[PDB]
Amino acid sequence: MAGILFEDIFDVKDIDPEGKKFDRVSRLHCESESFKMDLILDVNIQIYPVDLGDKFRLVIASTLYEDGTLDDGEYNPTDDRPSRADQFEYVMYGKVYRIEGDETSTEAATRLSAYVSYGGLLMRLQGDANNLHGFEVDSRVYLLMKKLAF
Amino acid sequence: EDREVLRVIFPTGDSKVVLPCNLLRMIWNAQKIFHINPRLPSDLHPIKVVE
Amino acid sequence: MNAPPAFESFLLFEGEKKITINKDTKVPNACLFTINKEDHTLGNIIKSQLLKDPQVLFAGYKVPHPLEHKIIIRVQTTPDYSPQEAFTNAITDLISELSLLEERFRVAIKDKQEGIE
Amino acid sequence: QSLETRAEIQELAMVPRMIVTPQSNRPVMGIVQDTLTAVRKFTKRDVFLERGEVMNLLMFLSTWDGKVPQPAILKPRPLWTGKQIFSLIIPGHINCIRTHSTHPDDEDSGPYKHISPGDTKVVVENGELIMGILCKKSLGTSAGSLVHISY
Ligand SMILES: [Zn+2]
Numbered sequence A: 001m002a003g004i005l006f007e008d009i010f011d012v013k014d015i016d017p018e019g020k021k022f023d024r025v026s027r028l029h030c031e032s033e034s035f036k037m038d039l040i041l042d043v044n045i046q047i048y049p050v051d052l053g054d055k056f057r058l059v060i061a062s063t064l065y066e067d068g069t070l071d072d073g074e075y076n077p078t079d080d081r082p083s084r085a086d087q088f089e090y091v092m093y094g095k096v097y098r099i100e101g102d103e104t105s106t107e108a109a110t111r112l113s114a115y116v117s118y119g120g121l122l123m124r125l126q127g128d129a130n131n132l133h134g135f136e137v138d139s140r141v142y143l144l145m146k147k148l149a150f
Numbered sequence B: 001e002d003r004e005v006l007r008v009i010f011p012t013g014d015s016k017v018v019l020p021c022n023l024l025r026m027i028w029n030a031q032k033i034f035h036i037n038p039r040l041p042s043d044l045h046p047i048k049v050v051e
Numbered sequence C: 001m002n003a004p005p006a007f008e009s010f011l012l013f014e015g016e017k018k019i020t021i022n023k024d025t026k027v028p029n030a031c032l033f034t035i036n037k038e039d040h041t042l043g044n045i046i047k048s049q050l051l052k053d054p055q056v057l058f059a060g061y062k063v064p065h066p067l068e069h070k071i072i073i074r075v076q077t078t079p080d081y082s083p084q085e086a087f088t089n090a091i092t093d094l095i096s097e098l099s100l101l102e103e104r105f106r107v108a109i110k111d112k113q114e115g116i117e
Numbered sequence D: 001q002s003l004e005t006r007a008e009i010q011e012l013a014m015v016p017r018m019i020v021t022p023q024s025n026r027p028v029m030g031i032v033q034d035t036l037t038a039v040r041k042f043t044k045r046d047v048f049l050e051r052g053e054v055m056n057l058l059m060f061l062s063t064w065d066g067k068v069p070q071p072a073i074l075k076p077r078p079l080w081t082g083k084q085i086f087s088l089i090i091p092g093h094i095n096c097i098r099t100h101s102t103h104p105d106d107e108d109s110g111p112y113k114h115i116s117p118g119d120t121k122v123v124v125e126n127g128e129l130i131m132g133i134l135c136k137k138s139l140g141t142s143a144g145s146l147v148h149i150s151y
Helices: B002-009 B023-034 B046-050 C040-052 C083-110 D003-013 D033-043 D051-060 D082-089 D146-150
Strands: A004-014 A025-032 A038-044 A055-061 A090-100 A112-118 A121-127 A141-146 C019-023 C030-036 C056-062 C070-077 D073-075 D123-125 D128-131
Touching (some): A112 A141, C030 C083, C070 C083, D051 D082
Antiparallel strands (some): A004 A055, A025 A038, C030 C070
């Protein structure tokens, strides 16, 4: 199984920030139950009906096919290796474009934000625990969303 | 000294001039191709740059 | 005047052949089929029968220029299975579906109807 | 009518060489008419394609390496986003910025209110479209445009 970059169970604060709202894609505003990490994320609401009262599980991984790399691209439907984080209801693939915190100060390098792009569906995370896993790198990172819990 | 001369060149104080070779876009290409990490310490001695 | 004779739209030319197969070198195990004097009626259906097949990695067709009767089909399959066989099978399979459709239709017409002929 | 004049035209006057005009150092030609409206409509973040439509578009491209990119949505069903398919067209590593400046987002102070992506900036890197709708401001004959950067 993929080396876990980030893992948490999130609660939805709001589904429409500014409220402007649109079709198929919707911008969630969320907060992690650790209450030390923040999240802003687009999801395809047309194929994954989110609710304001819903409590989601989110995972971030650097790979799927277990441990070796997958930078081949070419989604390859013919694979069948149960290595996959396939048990999850919603999965996205994408690239990181910015990451992003105060570092000018003494020591600083404290509290951190990551910006991710999943083919034009944007994501933003704030933290400090993901400091070893956020990188402005080529198309490699996957967002797995599951269950929406209970 | 260059800054002082440059004020005399553009008394109206506009920042926008036509020049060859987009230096910001090239530098931006250097970061993107060499995969330079903005957080990791750079491996470059300043005197090499000046020379 | 410069307008072709309209029958030249579908009759094969005496110095031409109906299909032509050329390999692609960009990726391993792949093929390019040229169908001459054919149109979207044929091209579009063969695309859908191939995509139904789970061994096919990629399938697509493109009519290179509207004034020019010809279509190309790119198909790519897994190394374990030749792409040519999928195409032949895809037609035969399609031939079978249309044959069953024709038998069911004639029989459905044969159902208690009147003035059927 | 000769090889010398055919050479002189091929080398000097031929259209891929008449692209960026010295008339005002910006491209002479960029994407026009109906295609330009269709490019706007296509890059919006809400566009998604099934395996069949992507394969059909890939089939119409020219320099396509032959490797279908992984869809931005794997589950519950395969989906490619619009920007993503566009990234196959953008050459080797052409890279712009900004050029969002349509009537979409804010007359400027709104985006600084923290980069609530809004959804209008056009960012591309390593020749791959990262975000934002394309238009006259990116593809047009404007000095700062994408077509200018390819040339
Ligand atoms: Zn103004």
